[PDB]
């Protein structure tokens with residue numbers, strides 16, 4: 001009954017794209033530092049995830065749009081939306097999460113399908129099946145590079161608990177994350193730097209709460225606002241983190257912004 005959103009951002013301005021799944025359609029709102037506008041993306045789906053990477057100043061976006069029978073990959077490479085090579089069978093209610101790293105890029109896409117999360121990987125030549133296989137109905141992911149080594153954190157929410165699964169190049173292990181919440185989580189994650197710093201937002205029965213990692217234990221963050229559905233993106237300006245959280249209750253999406261000095265309501269509108 002609430003819309004479902006996905007967001008990505010790039011550069012220091014920043015540029016942002018926010019995708020909203022509402023009543024079977026995914027549409028796009030865009031920011032390049034000078035007002036929100038409606039982007040061209042318009043495709044069927046009940047669930048959306050997104051990742052993006054830069055090649056110099058040129059943005060590349062990958063949108064994973066799930067209907068009741070298929071996930072389709074939609075590619076923006078500066079010159080129109082084109083269907084990509086990624087495909088997966090689904091059933092109604094399936095959820096995805098996507099990350100990418102480098103400029104090749106590498107991509108990992110996680111799908112929660114009938115209570116199981118599985119992983120598909122792009123290495124620059126083809127898609128292959130990843131080792132990840134854990135229970136979950138909802139999923140979010142974030143990733144960070146330490147030199148050339150990718151680190152991945154996946155937040156797997158079953159009916160009862162949210163577990164963090166960590167890839168460090170050698171195998172998947174359970175992470176320190178605890179939700180500080182009861183059963184029924186939907187999550188969104190972002191990360192920055194190489195420690196890393198992680199922020200995980202949980203929507204649970206209409207409330208969003210924040211859990212925080214800066215390298216030395218998980219703690220409850222200042223962010224606390226209503227929402228049935230959450231997404232997030234973040235960007236660095238030198239050493240300073242900026243965060244944009246997209247909180248939705250029904251068809252109303254409110255942006256909340258961290259710029260170093262508390263949460264403020266952002267200029268985002270759905271229009």
Ligand SMILES: CCN(CC)c1ccc2c(c1)Oc1cc(N(CC)CC)ccc1C2c1ccccc1C(=O)OCCOCCOCCn1cc(CO[C@@H]2O[C@@H](C)[C@@H](O)[C@@H](O)[C@@H]2O)nn1
Pocket residue numbers: 062073075077082083084085086104105122124125126
């Ligand atoms: C050799 C195998 N095939 C036939 C299956 C092939 C050949 C060339 C292209 C191919 C496919 O696909 C594309 C697709 C696009 N898109 C995105 C859908 C926008 C129109 C753009 C160009 C091509 C080109 C192309 C022709 C001439 C000059 C350049 C490029 C170019 O993409 O640049 C380098 C990367 O493509 C090289 C081909 O390598 C083998 C398979 N493959 C697919 C892609 C691009 O794949 C997309 O982006 C990936 C990151 C993933 O998200 C994929 O799922 C997605 O399909 N890169 N390699």
Ligand SMILES: CCN(CC)c1ccc2c(c1)Oc1cc(N(CC)CC)ccc1C2c1ccccc1C(=O)OCCOCCOCCn1cc(CO[C@@H]2O[C@@H](C)[C@@H](O)[C@@H](O)[C@@H]2O)nn1
Pocket residue numbers: 199210212214220221222223241258260261262
């Ligand atoms: C809620 C009431 N409490 C007691 C529980 C409280 C009060 C003050 C601080 C509190 C907590 O915590 C911090 C934490 C930091 N850290 C993390 C341990 C730095 C990495 C730093 C300062 C406080 C300060 C602090 C002291 C003096 C003056 C004001 C502030 C300040 O209000 O904090 C928020 C308002 O902004 C002040 C300047 O903030 C720039 C950097 N930064 C990071 C954070 C930590 O907040 C977490 O990370 C953010 C990125 C967001 O995700 C937050 O929602 C999240 O809580 N707070 N300040």
